[PDB]
Amino acid sequence: GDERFYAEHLMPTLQGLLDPESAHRLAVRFTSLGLLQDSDMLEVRVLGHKFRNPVGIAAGFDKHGEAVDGLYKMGFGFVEIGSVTPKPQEGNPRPRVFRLPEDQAVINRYGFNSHGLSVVEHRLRARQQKQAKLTEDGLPLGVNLGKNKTSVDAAEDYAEGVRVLGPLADYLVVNVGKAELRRLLTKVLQERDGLRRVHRPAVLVKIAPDLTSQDKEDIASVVKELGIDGLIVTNTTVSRPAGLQGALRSETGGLSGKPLRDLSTQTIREMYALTQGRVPIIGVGGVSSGQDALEKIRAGASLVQLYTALTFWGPPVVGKVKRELEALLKEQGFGGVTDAIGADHRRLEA
């Protein structure tokens, strides 16, 4: 009911008042304080868990696990925190976040600023009973694991994240030659298998859209060989699509938001084909409407995430994507999200 107020007045006012990193910090703190029903059609069972709805908040908004409960209150069907590095680290120098308002886009080069595993673990331990309730009610928690800039043993950094935060997570994410990738992911999976849980977390690989065809075939091959549980497609892009209008489009960093929509959907289609539909995909990049979510589901995604759209449309975007997706599924005769997954590949086969 508040869509137009946030879209035309509140969010533009906040963006005019604050630089984007300051607004980001305010948004996390405000969400952490809290303040204010999903159709059965939107339920997805995947990654060994129930998802009450398929619209998650992507990594990088709540990097340090400070606002999880508020994000569920906002309506997200799942929350991914991180990236979290083993030791605290500052990230890149400021300024490091740039708004492209004409393009409904952001460029960032945060550089994995992180409070570190211990601080984040302590925050999640404080709410671990609450999360157990939320997970069993269909609201899972994901943790994106990073590595420290100065680490010479990347696999050791990811393994430490599994040891510290694996007991608290429903899924874990590692952002990504082929033999090196195999060795690293083998270590992560062995550490995951070593946890003493009834519900050990799924392990996912998150990829950028900036990969060669050989890179994508190599990743698909290793993911299937090792039994990785899913893919997150995609991270931000270092590319700059034609026609960007924002004055800051030349800043170095990853571009997110509406300009990433096509590249991410194309990459979802390709990875779904290269894994023969065997590997669940979380589709990410430029989702700001139910139509965007449906396009990624038809391309092969089982779940979607959004981030940049929250910065332009505000909290109302979560209910908007969910109710629009539901309506589009009903309009087009799908029984639920699950029936639409990969529908675009069935069209092409026909």
Ligand X SMILES: Cc1cc2nc3c(=O)[nH]c(=O)nc-3n(C[C@H](O)[C@H](O)[C@H](O)COP(=O)(O)O)c2cc1C
Residue located via tokens 């690989």: 205
Contact yes or no for 220/275 (Cβ under 8 A): yes
Output the smallest distance, CB 27 to ligand F54, in A: 3
Considering only 31, 53, 85, 236, the residue that binds ligand ORO (CB under 6 A) is: 236
Nearer Cβ to ligand X, position 289 or 308? 308
| Tokens coding 180 | 């090196």
Show Cβ contacts of residue 95 under 8 Å, excluding neighbours closer than 6 positions.
19, 21
Contact between 99 and ligand F54 by CB under 6 A: the answer reads yes
Cα torsion 226, 227, 232, 234: sign: positive
Of these partners, ligand F54, ligand X, ligand ORO, none, which one is at the site of residue 131 (CB under 5 to 8 Å by kind)?
none
Considering only 108, 288, 289, 305, the residue that binds ligand ORO (CB under 6 A) is: 108
Nearer Cβ to ligand F54, position 20 or 342? 20
Cα torsion 270, 347, 51, 110: sign: positive
Show Cβ contacts of residue 108 under 8 Å, excluding neighbours closer than 6 positions.
60, 96, 97, 98, 236, 253, 254, 256
Per CB under 6 A, the segment of 10-18, 107-115, 191-199, 302-310 that binds ligand ORO is: 107-115
Map the footprint of ligand F54 across residues 10-69, applying CB under 6 A: 11, 14-15, 18, 20, 23-24, 27, 30-31
Output the smallest distance, CB 263 to ligand F54, in A: 19
Output the smallest distance, CB 173 to ligand X, in A: 7
Going residue by residue from 62 to 91, which x/- string records binding to ligand ORO, judged by CB under 6 A? ---------------------x--------
Show Cβ contacts of residue 156 under 8 Å, excluding neighbours closer than 6 positions.
187
Output the smallest distance, CB 316 to ligand F54, in A: 9
Q: What is the largest CA-CA distance in the chain?
A: 53
In 170-202, which positions are buried (b, 16+ CB within 10 angstroms) versus exposed (e)? bbbbbbbeeeebeebbebbbebbeeeeeeebbb
Per CB under 6 A, the segment of 9-17, 20-28, 110-118, 298-306 that binds ligand ORO is: 110-118
Of these partners, ligand ORO, ligand F54, ligand X, none, which one is at the site of residue 310 (CB under 5 to 8 Å by kind)?
ligand F54
Contact yes or no for 86/161 (Cβ under 8 A): yes
Using CB under 6 A, list all residues that contact ligand X. Answer: 58-60, 63, 82-83, 97, 106, 108, 110, 144, 175, 206, 235-236, 256-257, 260, 284-287, 306-309
CB atoms within 10 A of CB 48: 15
Output the smallest distance, CB 262 to ligand ORO, in A: 18
Alpha carbons 16 and 20: distance in angstroms, whole number: 9
Considering only 61, 72, 76, 110, the residue that binds ligand ORO (CB under 6 A) is: 110
Considering only 53, 131, 148, 175, the residue that binds ligand ORO (CB under 6 A) is: 175
Give the up-direction half-sphere exposure of residue 54: CA atoms within 13 A in the CB hemisphere: 35
Give 77: exposed, middle or buried? Use CB within 10 Å, 0-12, 13-18, 19+: buried
Of these partners, ligand F54, ligand ORO, ligand X, none, which one is at the site of residue 111 (CB under 5 to 8 Å by kind)?
ligand ORO
Of these partners, ligand X, ligand ORO, ligand F54, none, which one is at the site of residue 237 (CB under 5 to 8 Å by kind)?
none
Strands (E), the chain: 44-46, 49-51, 55-57, 78-84, 97-100, 105-108, 141-145, 171-175, 202-207, 230-233, 254-257, 281-284, 303-306
Residues at the contact surface with ligand F54, assessed by CB under 6 A:
11, 14-15, 18, 20, 23-24, 27, 30-31, 97, 99, 106, 108, 310-311, 314-315
Residues at the contact surface with ligand ORO, assessed by CB under 6 A:
60, 83, 108-112, 175, 235-236, 254
